[PDB]
Design a binder for this molecule. Structure first.
Ligand SMILES: O=C(O)CNC(=O)C(=O)O
Ligand SMILES: [Cl-]
Ligand SMILES: [Fe+3]
Ligand SMILES: [Zn+2]
Ligand SMILES: [Zn+2]
Ligand SMILES: [Zn+2]
Length: 413
DNA sequence: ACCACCGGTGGT
DNA sequence: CCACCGGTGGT
């Protein structure tokens, strides 16, 4: 690993990593995933996706899907997207780039988190501004224009800071990982309890399904316990962000730790909680640099055509829709109605845009640090009653010092 | 190079 | 409100 080519050119074959899983061929991946998940056959679904490196986006630079991978039946339990690396014959020729557990957390818990997080964050949440909230031009209105109701991200836990080259709480006597508006310890305590319990629950699923990435993220658990979430032995997570009707424009999460992954737990509005329902709107998670294969897991063309006809792979067509654009770009540190369309993305077969439609209670695992990814904008974003909430669990780089890096920073001053 | 980032504290 | 801390991938 590796002599297939003299140079691994990642802009040609895609980013190379094996910590979600890797093998000589697709069959080897099924064996790995069958072993990990504890079931065989129909319970596991593998889709081959192809890295094209050409980004699907609207004429305004905002996220679009060209294909949607949807849960095929209630019998399908685990979805894995795999990349067969262009021109490789070695033991890591095929790598796993996304794992989706459809039935991730109990539905009663997912129902409750959706209510409680919506209510808490609408009343007390302080929003976190991120780069990926806007397009390149900084002029789109994908989140909505009503500041009371627009899509938003709320970040909790620990985060890396360039100022300390370590945890942002380096100088905080009593850090509040779950800081809400004002100073209401009781509401923060409730929110902490929800997210800590969820961290605790998701850790063993992470270990089960992506053991190498998991084991990477727990290597320094005992050195930096204050920079970890979770209430039981085994604490891979450090930060968590709640995204409510939030359109994440194409991005990578660049200060996530090397060789780790992100877990996304999805909660949906009450009209999208039944298999085979037709919700009024939905949000998709998109890999803009990939296209779907002409062939299914096992190499059949016909089987892939079956899936396209059944809607297990939804082939989308281009749109031409009215959208808002701000008169001034949003800064660092009025609006007009414009035409937005996706026609150019659909004319080129090699422009990417593979989406998955995560369901209520599902858990998605991907290397967000390395893979370009995005979420689609809602028709009418409303964080007071969101179409989708994502809870995104991660660990940043350089979060391996005790007490949020207090001692190390003191040594510096 | 060079932009822009899932920021918090202490003192006016 | 303000000054104070300044690491890097993508391009
Ligand atoms: O919500 C999702 O599915 C994707 N979220 C992100 O990529 C993010 O918050 O960085
Ligand atoms: Cl990641
Ligand atoms: Fe992301
Ligand atoms: Zn946009
Ligand atoms: Zn090779
Ligand atoms: Zn910390």
């Amino acid at each position: 690993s590796c002599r297939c080519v003299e140079q691994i050119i990642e802009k040609d074959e895609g980013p190379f990593y094996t910590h979600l899983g890797a093998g000589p061929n697709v069959a080897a991946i099924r064996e790995i995933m069958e072993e990990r998940f504890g079931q065989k056959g129909k319970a596991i679904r593998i889709e081959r996706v192809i890295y094209t490196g050409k980004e699907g986006k609207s004429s305004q630079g905002c996220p679009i899907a060209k294909w949607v991978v949807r849960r095929s039946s209630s019998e399908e339990k685990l979805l894995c997207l795999v990349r067969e690396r262009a021109g490789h014959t070695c033991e890591a020729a095929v790598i796993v780039i996304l794992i989706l557990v459809w039935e991730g957390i109990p539905l009663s818990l997912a129902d409750k988190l959706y209510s409680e997080l919506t209510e808490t964050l609408r009343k007390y949440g302080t929003l976190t501004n991120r780069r990926c909230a806007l397009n390149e031009e900084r002029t789109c209105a994908c989140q909505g224009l009503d500041p009371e109701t627009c899509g938003a991200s709320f970040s909790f836990g620990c985060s890396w800071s360039m100022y300390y080259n370590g945890c942002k709480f380096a100088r905080s006597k009593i850090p509040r990982k779950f800081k809400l508006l004002g100073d209401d310890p009781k509401e923060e305590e409730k929110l902490e309890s929800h997210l800590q319990n969820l961290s605790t629950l998701m850790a063993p699923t992470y270990k089960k399904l992506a053991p190498d990435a998991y084991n990477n993220q727990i290597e320094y658990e005992h050195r930096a316990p204050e920079c970890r979430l979770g209430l039981k032995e085994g604490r891979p997570f450090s930060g968590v962000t709640a995204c409510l009707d939030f359109c994440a424009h194409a991005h990578r999460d660049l200060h996530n730790m090397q060789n780790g992954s992100t877990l996304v737990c999805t909660l949906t509005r009450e009209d999208n909680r039944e298999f085979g329902g037709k919700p009024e709107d939905e949000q998709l998670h998109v890999l803009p640099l990939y296209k779907v294969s002409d062939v299914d897991e096992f190499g059949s063309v016909e089987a892939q055509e079956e899936k396209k006809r059944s809607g297990a792979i939804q082939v989308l067509s281009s749109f031409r829709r009215k959208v808002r654009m701000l008169a001034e770009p949003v800064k660092t540190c009025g609006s007009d109605e414009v035409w937005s369309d996706s026609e150019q993305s659909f004319l080129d077969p090699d422009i990417g845009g593979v989406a998955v439609a995560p369901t209520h209670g599902s858990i998605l695992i991907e290397c967000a640090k390395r893979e370009l990814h995005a979420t689609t904008p809602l028709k009418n974003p409303n964080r007071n009653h969101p179409t989708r909430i994502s809870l995104v669990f991660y660990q940043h780089k350089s979060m391996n010092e005790p007490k949020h890096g207090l001692a190390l920073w003191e040594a510096k001053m």
